[PDB]
Amino acid sequence: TYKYVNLREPSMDMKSVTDRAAQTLLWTELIRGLGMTLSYLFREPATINYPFEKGPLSP
Amino acid sequence: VKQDMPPVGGYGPIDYKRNLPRRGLSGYSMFAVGIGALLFGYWSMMRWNRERRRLQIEDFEARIALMP
Numbered sequence: 001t002y003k004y005v006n007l008r009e010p011s012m013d014m015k016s017v018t019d020r021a022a023q024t025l026l027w028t029e030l031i032r033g034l035g036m037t038l039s040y041l042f043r044e045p046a047t048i049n050y051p052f053e054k055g056p057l058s059p
Numbered sequence: 060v061k062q063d064m065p066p067v068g069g070y071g072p073i074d075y076k077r078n079l080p081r082r083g084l085s086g087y088s089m090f091a092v093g094i095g096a097l098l099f100g101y102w103s104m105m106r107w108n109r110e111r112r113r114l115q116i117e118d119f120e121a122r123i124a125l126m127p
Contacts, residue, residue: 015085015087018086018087019085019086021086022086022087022089022090023086026086026089026093028083028089032082032083
């Protein structure tokens with residue numbers, strides 16, 4: 001049982017190759033990465049205020 | 060009695076899909092939006108340039124009539 005990555009070919013339809021060329025010329029998924037990082041910017045930070053809130057432990 | 064920790068009643072499903080929604084639209088729409096907004100800016104820039112050409116000719120009239 002196996003599941004291997006990266007077996008396709010870049011398409012020969014003009015729409016698919018112009019979408020990939022639009023990704024190349026237009027910095028698109030870079031901006032999508034910026035959107036993901038801003039989506040983690042607007043979370044609340046999970047820091048513990050150390051000398052007042054000490055960390056969790058075990059019995 | 061026994062007090063181990065088995066799965067009590069079975070646990071539900073856990074996803075493992077590569078779920079990428081592919082946000083955005085086709086690239087031809089992106090070229091259409093880019094060329095349209097660019098040409099919009101070109102027309103507005105053209106109109107403002109020739110308005111300031113009119114006013115620049117009026118300032119030339121000022122310096123001509125002011126000189127002797």
